[PDB]
Amino acid sequence: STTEEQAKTFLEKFNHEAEDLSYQSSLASWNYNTNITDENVQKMNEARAKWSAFYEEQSRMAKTYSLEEIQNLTLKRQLKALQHSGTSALSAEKSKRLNTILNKMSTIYSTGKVLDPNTQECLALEPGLDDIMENSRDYNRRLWAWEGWRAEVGKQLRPLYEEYVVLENEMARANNYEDYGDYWRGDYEVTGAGDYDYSRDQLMKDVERTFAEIKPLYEQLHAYVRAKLMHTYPSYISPTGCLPAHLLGDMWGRFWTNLYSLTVPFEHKPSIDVTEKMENQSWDAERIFKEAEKFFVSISLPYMTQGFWDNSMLTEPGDGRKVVCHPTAWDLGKGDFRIKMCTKVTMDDFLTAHHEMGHIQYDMAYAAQPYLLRNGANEGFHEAVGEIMSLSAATPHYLKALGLLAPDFHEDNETEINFLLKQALTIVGTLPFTYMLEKWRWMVFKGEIPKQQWMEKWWEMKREIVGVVEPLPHDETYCDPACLFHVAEDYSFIRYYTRTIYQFQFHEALCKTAKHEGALFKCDISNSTEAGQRLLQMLRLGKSEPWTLALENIVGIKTMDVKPLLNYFEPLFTWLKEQNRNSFVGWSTEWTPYSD
Amino acid sequence: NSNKLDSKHSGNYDYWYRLFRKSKLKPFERDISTEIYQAGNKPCKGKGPNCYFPLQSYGFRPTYGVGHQPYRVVVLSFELLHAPATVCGPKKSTNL
Numbered sequence A: 001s002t003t004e005e006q007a008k009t010f011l012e013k014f015n016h017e018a019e020d021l022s023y024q025s026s027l028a029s030w031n032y033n034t035n036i037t038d039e040n041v042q043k044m045n046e047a048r049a050k051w052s053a054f055y056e057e058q059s060r061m062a063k064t065y066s067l068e069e070i071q072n073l074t075l076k077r078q079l080k081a082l083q084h085s086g087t088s089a090l091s092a093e094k095s096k097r098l099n100t101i102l103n104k105m106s107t108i109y110s111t112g113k114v115l116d117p118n119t120q121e122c123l124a125l126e127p128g129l130d131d132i133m134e135n136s137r138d139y140n141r142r143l144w145a146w147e148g149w150r151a152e153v154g155k156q157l158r159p160l161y162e163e164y165v166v167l168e169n170e171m172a173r174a175n176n177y178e179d180y181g182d183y184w185r186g187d188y189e190v191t192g193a194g195d196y197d198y199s200r201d202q203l204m205k206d207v208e209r210t211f212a213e214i215k216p217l218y219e220q221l222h223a224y225v226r227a228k229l230m231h232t233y234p235s236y237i238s239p240t241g242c243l244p245a246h247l248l249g250d251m252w253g254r255f256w257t258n259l260y261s262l263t264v265p266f267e268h269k270p271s272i273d274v275t276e277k278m279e280n281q282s283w284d285a286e287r288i289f290k291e292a293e294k295f296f297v298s299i300s301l302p303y304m305t306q307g308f309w310d311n312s313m314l315t316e317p318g319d320g321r322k323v324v325c326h327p328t329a330w331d332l333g334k335g336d337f338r339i340k341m342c343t344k345v346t347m348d349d350f351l352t353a354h355h356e357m358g359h360i361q362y363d364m365a366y367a368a369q370p371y372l373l374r375n376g377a378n379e380g381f382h383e384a385v386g387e388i389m390s391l392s393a394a395t396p397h398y399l400k401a402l403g404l405l406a407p408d409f410h411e412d413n414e415t416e417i418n419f420l421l422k423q424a425l426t427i428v429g430t431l432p433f434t435y436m437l438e439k440w441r442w443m444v445f446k447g448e449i450p451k452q453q454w455m456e457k458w459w460e461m462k463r464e465i466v467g468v469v470e471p472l473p474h475d476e477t478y479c480d481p482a483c484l485f486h487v488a489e490d491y492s493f494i495r496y497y498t499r500t501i502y503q504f505q506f507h508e509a510l511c512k513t514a515k516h517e518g519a520l521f522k523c524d525i526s527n528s529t530e531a532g533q534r535l536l537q538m539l540r541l542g543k544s545e546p547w548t549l550a551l552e553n554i555v556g557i558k559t560m561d562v563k564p565l566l567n568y569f570e571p572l573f574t575w576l577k578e579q580n581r582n583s584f585v586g587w588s589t590e591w592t593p594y595s596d
Numbered sequence B: 001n002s003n004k005l006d007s008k009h010s011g012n013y014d015y016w017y018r019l020f021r022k023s024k025l026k027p028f029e030r031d032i033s034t035e036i037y038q039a040g041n042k043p044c045k046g047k048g049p050n051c052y053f054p055l056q057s058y059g060f061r062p063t064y065g066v067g068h069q070p071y072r073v074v075v076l077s078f079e080l081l082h083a084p085a086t087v088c089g090p091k092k093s094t095n096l
C-alpha cells in the first residue's frame, strides 16, 4: 500500500533485470578484451544499446516515485541512484549534440597526429610522446613536440570545450544543481545518516586543510627536483624561479616517475630487483597468481574459485590475435570474475597483478549486495584497496619471507632511501596536478571567471602553487590543460586523491592493528588474520552505508586526514630537511624561460 | 552441482522463480499464478508502471562462479504416521 513496498518491489525487479543486462554487457566487454573481431564489435554494439535502453526505461518508470515518503536508508539511496537522469533531463537535440561532440573528442584524441618541421615523421600520442619523454633527454625535442601537440589539440577543441561548459552548466541547473561542479560533488553527498552527514563544501574544506598541511613538503620536493635539474642542466633554469611545464618528466606533469635516473641521490647502490631471481626460478603467470593467492590467504581473504583459472586469460594469445592488456577487471558477478592483462617477466607486472587482485577481492566482497550497492562506497575505494596490497608486497621483508629474495641479505640504508624516493616520486607528484586540474574544472563549472582570462589565471595559479610555468606564454587562444585523457573523456580526478589518501589511511590503521614496529614503510600485512577480518569488515560494506562510516570501520575517524601522508615520509622528510640547509626554498612566479 | 548439464552458453532461460504475491506462503503448497502482481493500490492489466510479474529469470551461464551456478536440489519428505508401511528399507544376504 505504502510507497516503500512499491519501491522495494521495483528495486528487486531492477536488481534482477539490470543484473541480466549488465552480465551480458560485461561478458561482451571481456569479448572485446580478448577477440576484437567486427562480429563481437557489432555484438557489443547491440548489447550496449539494449542495456542503455533498459536502464533508461527503468529510470523513467522510477521517476514516478518520491524520496520524501520513504524512510529506509538503503532503499532511499537506491532510489537516489535510480533518479540520476544525467543526459535525459535535457532536450533530445541538445543531448544528441552533446554525444556527437563527445564522439568528436574521442576521435580527435585517438587520431591526434603532429608533424615535425620535416613532415615525413608521423607520431600520434603513442609511437612517440611517452617514449620521447621517457627516453630522450633533449630540451628542443620535448619543447617543440609538446608545444605543437598542445597547439593543434587546442585549435581543434577550444569551442567544443566552451559549449561543453555551457551545456554542462545547463544540465546541472536542470537537474537541481547549482553547477556541474556540484553535479560532480554529488557522489559524496550523504544525508539521513546522523553523525555522518557531509555537504558539497565540506569536502572542499577538507581539501583546503590538506593544502594547508601539505604545502611545505611539496615546496621542498619541488626545490630538490629543480636543484637536481640545475645540476643536470645549469644554463636553462633560474636558481629561484619556477620550472617550465615541460620539465616535469612525463606528458603533462602528472608523474615524476621518469625522473629517477636524474634524481637518484646515490646511483652506486643496487635497487631492490627480483627480476633476475624470477628468471632463476623460471617464474610464470600461473605461479604469479598462485603467489598472489597465497598472500591473500595469509590475510584470511578467500581462495581462487575454479572459474578464475578456467576462463580468465593469464598470458598473451601469441600473434594470431591481438589483445589490449591494460590491467583491468570489470564486475561480471554471480561469482564470475576474471582478469585480462599481459604477463611479462617484470616487477611492475607484480604491482599490476597485486592491484587488480585487490580490486577483484573488493569486487567480490560486496557480491551479495544489491546492484546499486555492488560498488565501492565511493569512486576511489576500489583503487585504494587494490594499491594497498601492491604497496605491502613491494616491501623487501615480504620478498625475503616468501622466497623470491634469499634470506642472506639485510636492508641497506641508501638502497631503502632510493626505494622510498621511488615510492615518493611515483605518488606525491600526482597529487598537486590532480589538485590543479580538479580545482580549475570546479571554477570552470562555477563560472566565476569570464572566458577571456582562463589560461592566464590558470597558469599564474600553477606558478604560484606548484611552480608550473609555460615554456611558451599563451593567451586566451589556447586550451593546453584540457588535453589530458580523463578530462578528454569527462572523468573526475578526485578519485586519485581519494585513492592515495585512503590507501595511506588503510595501511596506517592495518599496520597498527597488525603490530609492526620501526619505520612504517617496512611493515608487512601477512599472517595477520585479525587485520584481514578488520579489512573485510569494510570490504563487505559496499554502498549500503556512507563511505565515511566505512572509513570509520578501519581508522576510527570519519574524515580524511593528512597524518598518514606526514607519518609515512617522516625519515625521508628528515633527510631532505637536513640536506636543505644550503638550498633555496620557494619559487618566484615572475621568472619565465622567454623573459631575459 | 549441475553446470554442464543445466547451464548453457548464450543464456539458459527456462527456469522461472516467483518473487511477489499477495500474502505469505504455506509449506507444501502449489501457487502457480499466471496473475500479474500489482502494487501501489492501482490494479492494472499488468506489465507497466507499478505492475510486476511475479516470476523472474534464472540467468544461467556455464561461466558463473559457484555462488550462483545452477544447483540441482531435491528434498525428500517422510512421515512417521501410523499406517500400513509400504516403502521398506532393503535386506541383505550372506554366504551359506
Ligand SMILES: *[C@@H]1O[C@H](CO)[C@@H](O)[C@H](O)[C@H]1NC(C)=O
Pocket: A031, A034, A035, A036, A037, A039, A040
Ligand atoms: C574469438 O575471435 C573470433 C574471431 O577471430 C570470434 O569469431 C569469436 O567469437 C571469438 N571468441 C570469443 C569467445 O569471443
Ligand SMILES: *[C@@H]1O[C@H](CO)[C@@H](O)[C@H](O)[C@H]1NC(C)=O
Pocket: A004, A072, A073, A074, A075
Ligand atoms: C530496509 O531494507 C532492509 C533490506 O532490504 C530490510 O531488511 C529492512 O527490513 C528494511 N527496513 C524497513 C523499515 O523497511
Ligand SMILES: *[C@@H]1O[C@H](CO)[C@@H](O)[C@H](O)[C@H]1NC(C)=O
Pocket: A276, A277, A279, A280
Ligand atoms: C641466477 O642467474 C643465473 C641463472 O638464471 C645464474 O647465474 C645463477 O643460477 C643465478 N645467480 C646469478 C648471480 O646469476
Ligand SMILES: *[C@@H]1O[C@H](CO)[C@@H](O)[C@H](O)[C@H]1NC(C)=O
Pocket: A298, A397, A398, A401, A402, A524, A526, A527
Ligand atoms: C607467514 O607464515 C608462513 C608460515 O611459515 C611463512 O612461510 C611466511 O613467510 C610468513 N609471512 C611473513 C613472515 O610475512
Ligand SMILES: *[C@@H]1O[C@H](CO)[C@@H](O)[C@H](O)[C@H]1NC(C)=O
Pocket: A412, A413, A414
Ligand atoms: C646507513 O647504514 C650504513 C650501513 O650500510 C652505514 O654505513 C651508515 O652509516 C648508515 N647511515 C647513513 C646516514 O648512511
Ligand SMILES: [Cl-]
Pocket: A245, A252, A253, A480, A481
Ligand atoms: Cl600541464
Ligand SMILES: [Zn+2]
Pocket: A327, A328, A329, A356
Ligand atoms: Zn586497473
